[PDB]
Amino acid sequence: TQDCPECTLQENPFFSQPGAPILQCMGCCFSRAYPTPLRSKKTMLVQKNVTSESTCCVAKSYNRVTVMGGFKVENHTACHCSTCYY
Amino acid sequence: KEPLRPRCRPINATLAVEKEGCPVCITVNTTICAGYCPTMTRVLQGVLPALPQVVCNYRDVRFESIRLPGCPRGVNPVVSYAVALSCQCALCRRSTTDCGGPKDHPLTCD
């Protein structure tokens, strides 16, 4: 029976310069997949036999900065599980 | 149980089974895949081939049939359903799977 890490702000350690950390939203979010219902099939040009419902650990807010010379990284500042195919 | 955010594993639930043509719609006990899965987005821009994310998904499947009651003479009433043996955390391949978001509890007759 296994656990999954909360979706939170971790620290990216390749871009983090001391006293200038870059935060990344890493973590786990709830998802599920069951077989596509009949209703839905009668909606598809190409029948999909399985339906996946999913949320994903993403940035609620962030600021695009630049670091270590010329990397143009986006530094997150709040996470949450959201639409996965954005 | 002990996990707060359970990793992807089959969990049994009841799903609505019906065939276009028989009076009733029934429900059968099966196992689907539901759980948590680790995702993350890149911080570095210059977005090199954007990192595709994973969904909790079927691994090993089994099928079980059932004879639908009420079906008139002629119509075939045996309907097979998928049952999750193994669940795994992998990407949603858009060829076979309908990769979408949360519809609130679609597993239901009527």
Ligand SMILES: *[C@@H]1O[C@H](CO)[C@@H](O[C@@H]2O[C@H](CO)[C@@H](O)[C@H](O)[C@H]2NC(C)=O)[C@H](O)[C@H]1NC(C)=O
């Ligand atoms: C990236 O964003 C973080 C988040 O605000 C910035 O670091 C914050 O700095 C304050 C003051 O030291 C501390 O609270 C934390 O280190 C960070 N905030 C939080 C809520 O933990 C960081 O400066 C940003 N990086 C750049 C280059 O702007």
Ligand SMILES: *[C@@H]1O[C@H](CO)[C@@H](O[C@@H]2O[C@H](CO)[C@@H](O)[C@H](O)[C@H]2NC(C)=O)[C@H](O)[C@H]1NC(C)=O
């Ligand atoms: C959804 O449809 C896919 C495509 O046929 C199924 O995948 C195949 O499953 C069979 C057994 O049912 C295997 O023998 C094949 O090797 C699989 N092929 C591929 C490309 O995946 C899948 O089993 C179906 N899943 C559900 C839940 O019904």
Ligand SMILES: *[C@@H]1O[C@H](CO)[C@@H](O)[C@H](O)[C@H]1NC(C)=O
């Ligand atoms: C599926 O597993 C067992 C099988 O007997 C079942 O009793 C249980 O209710 C289901 N598990 C969960 C987590 O719902």
Ligand SMILES: *[C@@H]1O[C@H](CO)[C@@H](O)[C@H](O)[C@H]1NC(C)=O
């Ligand atoms: C749901 O389906 C089976 C069908 O025989 C049932 O016996 C059991 O409660 C569940 N299956 C498993 C593998 O837990």
